[PDB]
Design an enzyme around this catalytic site. Structure first.
Site, PDB file in Angstrom:
ATOM      1  N   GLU A  42       1.044  -1.170  -0.341  1.00  0.00           N
ATOM      2  CA  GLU A  42      -0.184   0.106  -0.263  1.00  0.00           C
ATOM      3  C   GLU A  42       0.988   1.501  -0.441  1.00  0.00           C
ATOM      4  OE1 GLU A  42      -1.058   0.777   5.133  1.00  0.00           O
ATOM      5  OE2 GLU A  42      -2.329  -0.438   3.848  1.00  0.00           O
ATOM      6  N   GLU A  99       7.625  -1.429 -14.364  1.00  0.00           N
ATOM      7  CA  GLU A  99       8.191  -2.576 -14.283  1.00  0.00           C
ATOM      8  C   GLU A  99       7.537  -3.980 -13.052  1.00  0.00           C
ATOM      9  OE1 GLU A  99      12.386  -1.734 -13.780  1.00  0.00           O
ATOM     10  OE2 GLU A  99      12.827  -3.798 -14.054  1.00  0.00           O
ATOM     11  N   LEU A 100       8.142  -4.390 -13.160  1.00  0.00           N
ATOM     12  CA  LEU A 100       7.762  -5.533 -11.727  1.00  0.00           C
ATOM     13  C   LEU A 100       9.144  -5.951 -11.079  1.00  0.00           C
ATOM     14  CD1 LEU A 100       5.807  -7.062  -9.379  1.00  0.00           C
ATOM     15  CD2 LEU A 100       5.663  -8.877 -10.994  1.00  0.00           C
ATOM     16  N   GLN A 114       0.559   5.491  -0.301  1.00  0.00           N
ATOM     17  CA  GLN A 114      -0.221   7.056   0.363  1.00  0.00           C
ATOM     18  C   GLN A 114      -0.903   6.679  -0.321  1.00  0.00           C
ATOM     19  OE1 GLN A 114       2.364  10.548  -0.377  1.00  0.00           O
ATOM     20  NE2 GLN A 114       0.155  11.163  -0.378  1.00  0.00           N
ATOM     21  N   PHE A 115      -1.177   6.482  -1.885  1.00  0.00           N
ATOM     22  CA  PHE A 115      -2.571   7.191  -2.620  1.00  0.00           C
ATOM     23  C   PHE A 115      -3.236   5.205  -2.632  1.00  0.00           C
ATOM     24  CE2 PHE A 115       0.385  10.245  -3.823  1.00  0.00           C
ATOM     25  CZ  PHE A 115      -0.284  10.838  -4.461  1.00  0.00           C
ATOM     26  N   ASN A 160      13.069   1.132   0.698  1.00  0.00           N
ATOM     27  CA  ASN A 160      12.793   1.935  -0.918  1.00  0.00           C
ATOM     28  C   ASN A 160      13.000   0.488  -1.594  1.00  0.00           C
ATOM     29  OD1 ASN A 160      11.108   3.302   0.562  1.00  0.00           O
ATOM     30  ND2 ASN A 160      13.014   4.698   0.538  1.00  0.00           N
ATOM     31  N   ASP A 218      15.160  10.168  -0.070  1.00  0.00           N
ATOM     32  CA  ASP A 218      14.426   8.736   0.688  1.00  0.00           C
ATOM     33  C   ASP A 218      15.188   7.504   0.113  1.00  0.00           C
ATOM     34  OD1 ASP A 218      11.504   9.947   2.041  1.00  0.00           O
ATOM     35  OD2 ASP A 218      12.050  10.884  -0.345  1.00  0.00           O
TER      36      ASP A 218
END
Ligand SMILES: CCC(=O)NCCn1cc(CNCc2ccc(Nc3ncc(Cl)c(Nc4ccccc4C(=O)NC)n3)cc2)nn1
Ligand SMILES: CCC(=O)NCCn1cc(CNCc2ccc(Nc3ncc(Cl)c(Nc4ccccc4C(=O)NC)n3)cc2)nn1
Lengths: 254, 259
Positions: free
Chosen positions: B17, B87-88, B19-20, B138, B133
Site C-alpha cells: 500500500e 516494471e515488476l 499513500q494513494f 525502498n 528517501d
C-alpha cells in the site's frame, strides 16, 4: 524423453540462486503421476545459444544418473524461457540447514550426511565419473536424515593437482569430499575463512590442513586427513570412505 | 504518450500500500510484445483533481530515469480508476528478502547489492537529482543478483536515516543522499535490521551529533565499514560522491570474490 511442456509446470517462489539464474520451486503436474514438488532451474543469458549449451548440458549430464543421494532430473523445457525441472529437496541448501539447525542436529546426523554423500560419490566413481565440485554448497537437504548431491574457481576445496595442473580425477574428488566432510562437521562454515584464495596453494603445499572441527570424532578427522594426502595415489577411494563412515556412524549412534 | 489500454492489464495479487492506495502486481500484454509482469499503483481518491495530479506526477518523476537499477515506468491509465504501471520486481522488497534469506545470501551478494544501488545513485547524481528517501525499505529485488531503487513516490520523518543537516536545516543535497546511502548499506549488511532500533528519534540526533555512529555489522569487511563511516561524516563536504562509492564498492566486491 525428458521434454516437459510449460503448461504442466506451475512456477512458484524463488528458492535460491543457481549458477545460471534464479531457482524456483514449483509443482509438476504429470498426466500419469501424482503432482510433485519440483525445483525449477531458470536461465538468464539463455538467449545466446552459447550459454544455453552450457545451461542445458547439466541436464544431459544428470540424466545419466540414478541414485537416492543425487538430485533427480525430472525434465527440461528447451524453448525459451529454458527451464530445468528437478525434484525438490524441501529443506533447502545444506550450508543454511547446518547453520540454522546447528544446535538441533546431533553429531551422528552430521556423520550420516557425510555417509550418504559418500554413497553418491561411490556411485559416481563406479560410473567412472569425476564430479569436480564436491562442496557443502552443492548439497541439498531432502529430509533431516537425507541429503543429496547436486550441481553437475573453488580454490579452497580443490586438490593440489587441480590448482597446479588442472588435473581432475577420482582422487581429486576425494580431496574435495574431504573438505566437504569438514564443512558438514563445522556446521556449514567455509574452509580457510579469512584466507585469500591466493594463499591457499602455498599453505597446502607446505602441509597446512584444515584443523579438526570442535566435537568432530578423532577417527572421522583422520578420515578427512587421508583425503588430503598431497600425493593423489595415497588417497582412499569412495568405497573405502563409505565403509569407514558407516562404522564411525554406527558407533556414534551407540 | 504513456497511456495504456486497460483491456491490456489484468490485475493480480496486492503487494503493498502507498499513500494513494494499494499496489498490485499484474500482467500486461503489450502490442508487439508478449505477456509482461507489472506492478500497478492504484489511487483511491483519484476523483479529487489535486490527488490525481499528485499521483500522476509520481509517474512523471519516474519517466525521466532510465537505469538498470531503477524501476521503470511502463505507462499510465488516466481514466478512473487511475493506475500507474511499473516494471515488476518479482522477489519483492529488499528488507524482507534479506531477513528471510539471511543464512543463504553470500556476503558477496550483500556487497553486490550495495554496489548496484551506488550505480543507480551515481546515475541520479549525474542528473543533479536528489532522492531524499534512500533506505533499504525502498530497495526492490528483481533477482537474487539484481536490486533496484523502487518507485520514488512509494519511497515517500525518516530521522534515523537522515543526514544531520537534513534534520537540523532541511537541507537535502547529493551529500545527504550519500549519508542515507551509508545507512542503507548498514541495513543491507545487517540483513534488514533497521538502524537505531529501540531508540527514539530525538535521541538519535543527539548520539550522531555526539559522534556516535552505527556499529560495524557482524562479518562486515572493515574496508566496507570504513566506507560507511566516510558517508557519515558530519560535514557534508567531506562525504564522497557516489562515483567514488561505486568504485570502492567494486574493489570491496572483488576482494570478497577473492575471499
Ligand atoms: C527455518 C529458519 C530460517 O531462518 N529459514 C530461512 C527462511 N527461508 C527458507 C527458505 C527455503 N528455501 C530454500 C530452498 C533451497 C533449495 C530447495 N530445494 C532445492 N531442491 C532441488 C534443487 Cl535442484 C535446488 N536447487 C537449488 C536451489 C537454490 C540454490 C541452489 C540450488 C542448487 O541447485 N544447489 C546445488 N533446491 C528448497 C528450499 N528460504 N528462506
Ligand atoms: C494489510 C495486511 C496484509 O496482510 N498485507 C499484506 C500485503 N503485503 C504483501 C507483501 C509482499 N510484498 C511483495 C512484493 C513487493 C514488491 C514487489 N515488486 C515491486 N515491483 C515494482 C515496484 Cl515499483 C514495486 N513497488 C512497491 C510495491 C510495494 C511496496 C513498495 C514499493 C515500492 O516501490 N517501494 C519503493 N514493487 C513484488 C512483491 N507485503 N505485504
Amino acid at each position: 524423453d525428458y521434454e516437459i511442456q510449460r503448461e504442466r509446470i506451475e512456477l512458484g517462489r524463488c528458492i535460491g540462486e543457481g549458477q545460471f539464474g534464479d531457482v524456483h520451486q514449483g509443482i509438476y503436474m504429470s498426466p500419469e503421476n501424482p503432482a510433485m514438488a519440483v525445483a525449477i532451474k531458470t536461465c538468464k543469458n539463455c538467449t545466446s545459444d552459447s550459454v544455453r549449451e552450457k545451461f542445458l548440458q547439466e541436464a544431459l549430464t544428470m540424466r545419466q544418473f540414478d541414485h537416492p543421494h543425487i538430485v533427480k532430473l525430472i525434465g527440461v523445457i528447451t524453448e525459451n524461457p529454458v527451464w530445468i525441472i528437478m525434484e525438490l529437496c524441501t529443506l533447502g541448501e545444506l550450508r543454511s540447514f547446518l547453520q540454522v539447525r546447528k544446535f538441533s542436529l546431533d553429531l551422528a546426523s552430521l556423520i550420516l550426511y557425510a555417509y550418504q554423500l559418500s554413497t553418491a560419490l561411490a556411485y559416481l566413481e563406479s560410473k567412472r565419473f569425476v564430479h569436480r565440485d564436491i562442496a557443502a554448497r552443492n548439497v541439498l537437504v531432502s529430509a533431516t536424515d537425507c541429503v543429496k548431491l547436486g550441481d553437475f574457481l573453488p580454490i579452497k576445496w580443490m586438490a593440489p593437482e587441480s590448482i597446479n595442473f588442472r588435473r581432475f580425477t577420482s582422487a581429486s574428488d576425494v580431496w574435495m569430499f574431504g573438505v566437504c566432510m569438514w564443512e558438514i562437521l563445522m556446521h556449514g562454515v567455509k574452509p580457510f575463512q579469512g584466507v585469500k584464495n591466493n594463499d591457499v596453494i602455498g599453505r597446502i603445499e607446505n602441509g597446512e590442513r584444515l584443523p579438526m572441527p570442535p566435537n568432530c570424532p578423532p577417527t572421522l578427522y583422520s578420515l578427512m586427513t587421508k583425503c588430503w594426502a598431497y600425493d593423489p595415489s595415497r588417497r582412499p577411494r569412495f568405497t573405502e570412505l563409505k565403509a569407514q563412515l558407516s562404522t564411525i556412524l554406527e558407533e556414534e549412534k551407540l
